[PDB]
Amino acid sequence: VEPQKFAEELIHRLEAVQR
Amino acid sequence: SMKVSRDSKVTTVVATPGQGPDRPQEVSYTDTKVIGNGSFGVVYQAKLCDSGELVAIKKVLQDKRFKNRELQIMRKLDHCNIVRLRYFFYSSKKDEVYLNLVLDYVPETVYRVARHYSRAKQTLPVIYVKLYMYQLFRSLAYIHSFGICHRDIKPQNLLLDPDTAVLKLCDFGSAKQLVRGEPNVSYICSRYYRAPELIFGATDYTSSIDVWSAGCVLAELLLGQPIFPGDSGVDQLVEIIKVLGTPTREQIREMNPNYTEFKFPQIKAHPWTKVFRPRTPPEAIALCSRLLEYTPTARLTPLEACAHSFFDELRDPNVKLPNGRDTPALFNFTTQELSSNPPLATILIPPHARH
Amino acid sequence: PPPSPC
Ligand SMILES: Nc1ncnc2c1ncn2[C@@H]1O[C@H](COP(=O)(O)OP(=O)(O)O)[C@@H](O)[C@H]1O
Ligand SMILES: [Cl-]
Ligand SMILES: [Mg+2]
Ligand SMILES: [Mg+2]
């Protein structure tokens, strides 16, 4: 599990729920 | 050589007691029935021929591909909030060996009890929340004093005798003695209860992951459902972030240094008093916020949690169960249980419990 | 989620 790939997914998801 | 004869069908094995030096003795039991089954093995209920007492027999396959520490860990445990290992024995997947664990039988779990209230649309009364959480923290304080981390704390692993309201921690198939300096597997703990450092893939975590899991149990009991659901790690971390807000760089560093340089979107925290129902007791909210912390070293220790103001009602001499009976034994702390912080005895043992 | 490998 690469940090880069994980953070990439997390960043994408957080942008979506971001007010 | 398991001799199975008839009295009612009786099974005889030579089994080794859980405590002391290995001195195996003949054990006879009857009335066997499955009370649980999985890909790990089988779990049976049975009746000891001699005493008539009920026991559970957890049958687990000897998987040589993974570390099997469950037996060795249970054998050194002896506490009122941890399920007792009476005996163990081996038996026959043909041409393969199974480990049989004979435990005290406990009829319910925290999960099953909580599920009753959920489908009834009622909240678990605070008194039971206090009692169950307190006993959980006691068992954690105990196993942590040996350096043992459970690594699978969740409602399904918390056995209940609802008549006496006694909670017993079970399932040590994931448990391990953590050694500072030796890496551990990060993909551990069950979904919904995995600490953030585990989701971030930390291999150097400590026993404080058990405290996070406990914080999730507490929150679940107050809420009526899991607080951080989600199928994957990202799904769960999002739910966590939606409550705690985006972790700071220092917090990310405390969890896993390899993530310190990513620019995560900055999501604001949802205030705890807005997370739970408006009827929720303030001290439960306070306790929960001190368990569900990003920084593992900022979380309360189990012994400190026991001393928290939320459990003050349990230290009242006049306190009693809703059914009429007295509360279980809550104050019989040993020097070992208190080894992490001996001065906490002043709070943990009320004056009326000194006599 | 199993424990560590051997
Ligand atoms: N000592 C016991 N007495 C009664 N039921 C038990 C006992 N131990 C476990 N169980 C039940 O069987 C289930 C599985 O036990 P567990 O040790 O957690 O197995 P697993 O490691 O496969 O999850 C538990 O959720 C619990 O409901
Ligand atoms: Cl936001
Ligand atoms: Mg289990
Ligand atoms: Mg297990």
Residue numbers in the entry:
A (entry chain B): 383 to 401
B (entry chain A): 25 to 31, 35 to 119, 122 to 384
C (entry chain C): 1604 to 1609
Quote the paper.
Glycogen synthase kinase-3 (GSK-3) is a highly conserved kinase that in higher animals functions in insulin signaling, microtubule regulation, inflammatory pathways, and developmental programs including Hedgehog, Notch and Wnt signaling. Here we show that the auto-inhibitory pS9 peptide sequence and the inhibitory LRP6 c- and e-motifs all bind to GSK-3 as pseudo-substrates.
The LRP6 complexes were produced by replacing the first 12 residues of GSK-3β with the 8-residue c- or e-motif from LRP6. In addition to these interactions, the LRP6 peptide complexes also reveal a water-mediated connection between the backbone carbonyl oxygens of the P+2 proline and Tyr216. The absolute conservation of prolines at the P+2 and P+5 positions of the five individual PPSP motifs of LRP6, as opposed to the variation that can occur at the P+1 and P+3 positions, agrees well with the observed importance of the P+2 and P+5 sites for proper C-loop engagement, as well as the preponderance of prolines found at these positions in bona fide GSK-3 substrates. The kinetic and structural data presented here demonstrate that the phosphorylated LRP6 repeat motifs act as direct inhibitors of GSK-3 catalytic activity.
